[PDB]
Design a protein around this nucleic acid. Structure first.
Ligand SMILES: [Mn+2]
Ligand SMILES: [Mn+2]
Ligand SMILES: [Mn+2]
Lengths: 427, 419
DNA sequence: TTAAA
DNA sequence: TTAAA
RNA sequence: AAAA
């Protein structure tokens, strides 16, 4: 009977990692967790212990040991002696990575006196190594222990998750037999260092013409009044000062979905109805105003992830959505898992500081919610390099690592965004 | 000699609190910190230990002990054997609250060979010996708190140095009193709706419209209609709020919207409009809440500028500054308050992320963030659930208030903060 | 519970 | 480094 | 997983 003992704190991922690596060598498993006590402002980590038992397949070889007070040395010592298994064990391995400082201090010494092979362990979050106290070995688990998106979100209490594959992408369904032509044309301009010029034309005249009153592109009356009120106008900027590579992008859409009417801007007559207007520009405007960039970035990384033996739908995906039980859901543009570190990618074409700054707070908090406190967040913006370096420094929080856990890319990174994501995440 | 040993992690506040309370009873102090080794992704907590020595006035009775690897047991014990003071100490007290788990285990065991251990419970605000409540015993100011978290250039305003008191001098008290009456009479929801329509449809068209008369006159023409709703369907209490403003800073020409003639220059427009629009668009709500909180804390022991203030801004060295609407310190816990008048879920969610992260940066991982919005009760509850994060405690660290709380917001903040 | 403004 | 949109 |  070889027993492995884990300390269940509020970060379940370290215990899942050590469990996945050591279960093959032990016969019994003791999960020490906290009880809920409102009077001392103590919540319970029991939900994580069940998820640890579930996703490690411990079954009845798992012993749950609750602690009444995780900050009282006496109660911890007492609760251990009363509830710790008294069977004669040959080996006792305690990984003291989780829990409070009082938990690790007193559990360790209680099991250092009671015992018989003994070994203390700790998983390093910085360099991904399992350090043994007496064996003096530091084995890396970075490339060996794996985890998929379902397991990772589940042990963090997130259920009902869905996402899109490369083949089931939403705008492929909307632009059948055109999507590849539209996406190949955009990609070529972005790889031709036209990203900056695109986002300027997108701000003016594009967003001046095709944005404003809600349902502007679905009621011809609203769109009629808007173009009249645009009669210095963005229409001439579009008609007369639109560069050629955008004309190539605009003409990549099918004629029935082109924003242009030749080499000028399509304006509906009084014959064109509400549904006619919507069927022409709605999907094309929504794709050009931002959705295209989600697909572009995902397309520039899928090959590099498959080369590293990652599997789509388990280790990367697009348009992920998840939620806790009976709680609102959230959306994440792209997700990636390197070994067992979550990387969440949030995308925007905006170049405006305030908007991107708020995007940064968002992606930081979401990856902590679903991947634990060692996740990495990447924000990709249309800002210049000075603005992106400013944002990283603005939002950086110090956890004890030299490597950044919040990364901002900008408009100068778009043309080679594949390799830059690859270097940031895996190197 | 009686020596106190602290473990310097990346949260310096528990070490300040434990240090403030136990400095009196001890002679020497050992601060065990981490070296910087980029090759193992390990950064140094030396900057925090220096701040601990400075703001606790440890002077030369403080000994910095570095560790080359805070993740490796043997490398720790070695650096502990070769560096820890071998002088004869009659009493040794190790507080193992900070640092990594390896640090607290092997430093504890090292010192036990040569003894008392203590720990500061973040959940019940007590120091526990291997239990004294410090919640109302140890105090800190905004300057000390941000400084130990490495922030500098801290500035903020007082009730009497509020910026808009200098922009509407001889009229701010009437303006603020008018707005407060409307919110005290449960008209917050009505006010919010009128700001969304037609106020922000007229005065928030695009960029720098309130600065260029050409841009403003153009926007007026396209509207000609929210100008009609403004002139005709504006509630009486809102006309009273508008007419409380100085005449050269009024948005209304009599009982109708003012329209600049070609004569009005860019300086004449902005001086008449820009300050008034920005205050009504939402800055008023910052002042309203602050005035209510300063009222409720009139009996408590907090001093303005040490434990609460408005419009806090600070920065790290060579780093961008942030802005925080209101700050409060209860004992040694930072309470950050972000205010918005918006009723929109998307906008209020993004403000929630912001205030959760900011208070964590400047006040440590045990800070409390409060977001005050103009949403209804169902949306505020949904937002609290959406953004909640498990900390180990049963009391919430992210709190959202909505439009129904505006009238009694002073009592609401007092009850949430002081428990 | 679009994306950007 | 507006607060809203 | 460096006041769970
Ligand atoms: Mn699976
Ligand atoms: Mn996005
Ligand atoms: Mn605010």
């Amino acid at each position: 009977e070889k027993v492995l003992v884990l300390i269940v704190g509020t970060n379940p991922l370290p215990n899942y990692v050590v469990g996945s690596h050591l279960k093959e060598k032990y016969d019994k498993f003791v999960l020490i967790y906290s009880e809920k006590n409102d009077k001392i402002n103590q919540n319970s980590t029991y939900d994580y212990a069940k998820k640890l038992k579930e996703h490690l397949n411990l079954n009845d070889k798992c012993i749950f040991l609750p602690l009444s007070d995780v900050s009282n040395s006496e109660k911890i010592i007492n609760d251990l002696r009363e509830k710790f298994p008294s069977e004669d064990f040959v080996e006792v391995h305690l990984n003291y990575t989780g829990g409070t400082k009082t938990m690790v201090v007193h559990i360790y010494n209680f099991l250092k006196e009671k015992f018989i092979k003994f070994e203390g362990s700790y998983l390093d979050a910085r360099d991904y190594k399992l350090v043994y106290d007496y064996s003096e070995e530091a084995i890396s688990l970075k490339d060996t222990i794996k985890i998929d998106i379902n397991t990772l979100l589940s042990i963090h209490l997130y259920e009902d998750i869905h996402f899109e594959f490369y083949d089931t992408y939403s705008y492929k369904q909307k632009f059948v037999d055109s999507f590849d032509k539209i996406s190949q044309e955009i990609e070529k301009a972005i790889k031709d260092d036209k990203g900056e010029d695109f986002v300027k034309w997108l701000e003016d005249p594009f967003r001046k013409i095709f944005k404003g009153e809600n349902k502007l592109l679905e009621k011809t009356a609203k769109f009629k009044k808007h173009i009249e009120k645009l009669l210095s106008s963005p229409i001439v900027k579009f008609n007369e000062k639109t560069p050629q590579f955008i004309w190539d992008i605009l003409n990549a859409f099918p004629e029935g979905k082109k924003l242009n009417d030749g080499q000028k801007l399509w304006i509906p007559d009084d014959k064109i109805t509400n549904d006619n207007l919507s069927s022409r520009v709605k999907d094309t405007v929504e794709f050009l105003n931002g959705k295209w960039f989600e697909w572009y970035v995902y397309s520039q990384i899928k090959s590099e992830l498959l080369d590293r033996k990652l599997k789509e739908g388990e280790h990367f995906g697009i348009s992920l959505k998840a939620q806790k039980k009976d709680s609102p859901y959230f959306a994440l543009d792209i997700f990636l898992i390197n070994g067992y570190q979550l990387i969440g990618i949030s995308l925007t074409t905006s170049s405006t500081r305030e908007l991107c700054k708020l995007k940064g707070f968002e992606v930081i908090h979401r990856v902590r919610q679903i991947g634990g406190d060692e996740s990495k967040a990447i924000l990709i913006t249309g800002m210049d390099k000075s603005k992106t370096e400013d944002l990283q420094k603005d939002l950086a929080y110090e956890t004890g690592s030299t490597q950044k856990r919040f990364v901002v890319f900008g408009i100068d990174d778009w043309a080679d965004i594949g390799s830059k994501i690859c270097e940031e995440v895996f190197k």
